[PDB]
Assembly symmetry: none
Homo-oligomer: 299 residues x 4
Amino acid sequence: SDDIRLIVKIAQLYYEQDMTQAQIARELGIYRTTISRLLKRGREQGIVTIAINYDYNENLWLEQQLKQKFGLKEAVVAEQLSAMGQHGALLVDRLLEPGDIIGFSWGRAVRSLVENLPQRSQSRQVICVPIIGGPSGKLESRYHVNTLTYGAAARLKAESHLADFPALLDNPLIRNGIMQSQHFKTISSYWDSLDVALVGIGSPADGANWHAFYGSEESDDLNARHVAGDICSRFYDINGGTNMSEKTLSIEMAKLRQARYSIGIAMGEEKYSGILGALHGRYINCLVTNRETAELLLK
Amino acid sequence: NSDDIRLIVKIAQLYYEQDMTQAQIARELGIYRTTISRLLKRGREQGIVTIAINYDYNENLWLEQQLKQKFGLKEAVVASSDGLLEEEQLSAMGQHGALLVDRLLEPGDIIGFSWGRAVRSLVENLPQRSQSRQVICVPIIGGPSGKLESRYHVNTLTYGAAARLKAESHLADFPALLDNPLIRNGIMQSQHFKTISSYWDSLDVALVGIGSPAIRDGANWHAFYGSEESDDLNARHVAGDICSRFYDINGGLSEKTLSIEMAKLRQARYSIGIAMGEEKYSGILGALHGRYINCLVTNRETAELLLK
Amino acid sequence: SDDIRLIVKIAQLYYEQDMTQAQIARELGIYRTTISRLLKRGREQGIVTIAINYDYNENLWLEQQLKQKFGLKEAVVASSEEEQLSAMGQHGALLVDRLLEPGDIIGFSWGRAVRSLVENLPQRSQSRQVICVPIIGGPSGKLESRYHVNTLTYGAAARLKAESHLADFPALLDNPLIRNGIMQSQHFKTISSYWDSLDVALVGIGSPAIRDGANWHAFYGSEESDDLNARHVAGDICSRFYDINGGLVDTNMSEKTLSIEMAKLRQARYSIGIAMGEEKYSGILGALHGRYINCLVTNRETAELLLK
Amino acid sequence: NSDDIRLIVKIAQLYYEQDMTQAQIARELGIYRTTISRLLKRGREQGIVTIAINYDYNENLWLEQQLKQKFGLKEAVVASSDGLLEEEQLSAMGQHGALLVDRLLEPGDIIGFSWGRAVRSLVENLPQRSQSRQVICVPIIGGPSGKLESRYHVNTLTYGAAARLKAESHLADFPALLDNPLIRNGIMQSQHFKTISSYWDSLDVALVGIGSPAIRDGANWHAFYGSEESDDLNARHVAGDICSRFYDINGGLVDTNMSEKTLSIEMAKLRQARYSIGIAMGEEKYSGILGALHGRYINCLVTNRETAELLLK
Ligand SMILES: [Cl-]
């Protein structure tokens, strides 16, 4: 009755080599009718027991999967932009430390997450700032970065410092001129040491079409340089790595990375290239997203 | 959830809305009544119901008519508040200013906003409309460039109003002041600036607060414009400003500035200045002498000052 | 105008003397019917305004009322038997959640109240960087285990993903020599050392009126508790007793007690008492008059008793 | 959270829980033969269901029987190892120890607990019973007095067990050690100590971990008892301890300056226990495991592969 030693060797090929019961019967020359008897009776006590978890969390599993694959400090999987909004907001709430400098980008995504921050009763002693200039009309007002920065600060009962320059100027001499000003200096100065960043992700693939933004001439040229996505108007390729660069007021990615948490929030297969690039580039080290697009990134 | 407070609230309507007698109400509700007096009493003390008696209804009104008469204002409101704490004087004007503003707008209007403590209160107290009037909100001045708290920023104010008004809004992405003229000249060229200025040319109503030299607010002139420039201002005998346009105490009237011209502010059906002070009198007065404002929203003391 | 003085003068008597129209009409010698015309008007023209606050929050109000009356930094009144200790538990927990700052030292007491509040703290994913400790010794069998202070201290710490430091001495020893011997030990020194600088305390309130398992009779035994009634003791906290006027009452088990003194409890930023039931009114009052607690979590019912 | 995984769970349970096969499981739910397999594979891959194989079923069992034979243990469990790291070895024993413990209890039992990494992993793994078995939990030693992390405290362990067992519990309010005797004696005279000791006198089962000198894991002897006392221990030849009672590698009780300072169960009483289960592993705990067996201070032994073979030389 110590044929047990076999039940280990048998369930061995059954649950690891998965050679079927007709495959197990013939290779070790055993009656396929005796191949079936060993496994089952054992289940009475040890002799190999399998456990199945009833309360399992798919989303949670996907988060760990994302963290593993991309080396993210954290991730959250959830007009389901609102679901992202709520859980992202929680991630951001949990992450804040007194004395932090949070930076903000623009758009439906970041707004979604700010719209869901918790109203606080005392100052959280953090400081909100924009990490990019104004849309220059290119965005609706409720999506303006300053609106979002100010809105956040209001939920967080916190200091805020709005930017009075555009993200994109007509020529380098105007932009560098602006960079010389004590106000730009002051703003960037917070950039140079921001703790948490909170960011949307652009791609070539809605009103915020790179076409409608920088205008065809320029976007057709972005496609030429193999640009996967952009962040804060700083562009990267699919492996994570520009005519308007000499004309852009925004945080340099280099500085974005020194940031304890750089939390990207995005969704949709249309933005996979951008999301990927952003991940490969380490420009973001946290990801808020939906279930669907999370699976795309794991494949 | 709450106690029989609903019943209390209801009897509040009877006695206060319909001015019915306690006895009549009691018979109607089959309530023993004494219970009624008790409830009426409670509703009042627990701030379920709050009654307010404008004691100054008469003098404020008279003062409004004099201001109209002396300066030929289209409209004028004089708020007064016994609590002499300043943030309270502002709420006084804010509430009333807002009402004035609510009833003055007309479908299709372009509202322009300036910055500051005052314009802000007016906005804070705007009636939260349930349906869009089809109005549009715009800054009539570039950004503070860090010189003002965020809750006082011009965009903040514009956008915030738009919310109450269910109006679309258009935020400005340039500063109110530039260190150099070249940059200012270059910026005027941009399509964006052209679009925002495009609205200034057709502005229908304006909420505008008034600055003066005497201000000791952090929003001081030596603070905003810095030492040297403040002298050149007092050196030219300047009484005050609106959207950083300067004028003397008689109304009479920059290559770095990005804001609406007074020319355009005057073309406005209603230019509404809102201010209080006495250290602002110099500037309020100059604003009236120049008809840079049709309407004036202000408190009792300031009005007293402007009448003698 | 002129009838404007009267509208006021009438509104004054209707709303400030809560006189009846019949009365107003009478004193003044006005036809009762114009007294009514004049009220109708007074409101129509905004000389008189009547706000009925539809989204009124009774509990909310009671909280402010308690804060005002007793100078509390905060207070929470809740509503729903034990099912109502649970309402307290949930909202208290929120108060405590909102109040925590990184680097805080939370101290805990014992009993159904505190457990309830802790049972409802939010499970955290990272360490809140706070430290949980007991501010009292063990029950020495006098309490069920799920109410033991260490259980509660440890439980809290587990919800808060936080440091915790359990106490290995009893709250009450047979004679002073033992008690001071214990006080000489490095472990007692260490524990108390946290007491000497605890940020948030979280505490239940004892009283004589109680006849649940935690009867002072059962705990200290008759001889002792009869003598507490003699010294006019209203309540207790962490086995430190006070009178109805919040006066401390040295009690004779005083020299046999391992627990935080209250000089020390008070140095504490937030000392949050959590209690309810008219049977404990004396204790809650004393605790409030004594300033031993500066926050109150409680139910609606007992909140009303405290404003009476 | 669904939808498919809401489904993988359904299928998994029939197929595994109910033994129902696929061609018929697919029959029940109107889906595909290819698909059921796909789903099962997915569930296995994604961790919804995990299966475990006891490769070492044979050697562990033989080792169990030898331990019983050499030392006359009532029972013995050997969890597998050398395919695992420190904290994992514990879980290995914990799980199995727990099972051993679950089946040994009998209605009306008094369970006593000691402190430490080991006794804890046994408790962590106790089966969460749905109905009270009328057992009672008690410390068999006073508190650590700060010398141990909270999650290892004796009360923590007792109370935590009681939770799994739906048993009432009784926590101790005195330390396991007191520098000074006035204090210690004053405590033994208390109604409370008397009550807790009252239980030691009738103890039915005991979870107990073993200490040694060769320890170098925070809970060191120089650390717990301090410099001088550690010498007097090595000076007297102690091989190890159970509830701070000391003994030599032959089982004989060793006396120490401490005996008159200690507040814990006497070894006389631990032996009176129906089952006294020691749980330990580690070539450095050898000296102390062995002494515990030579003294029959433990009937049962829960331990890993490496140590098992060590005791069998
Ligand atoms: Cl808990």
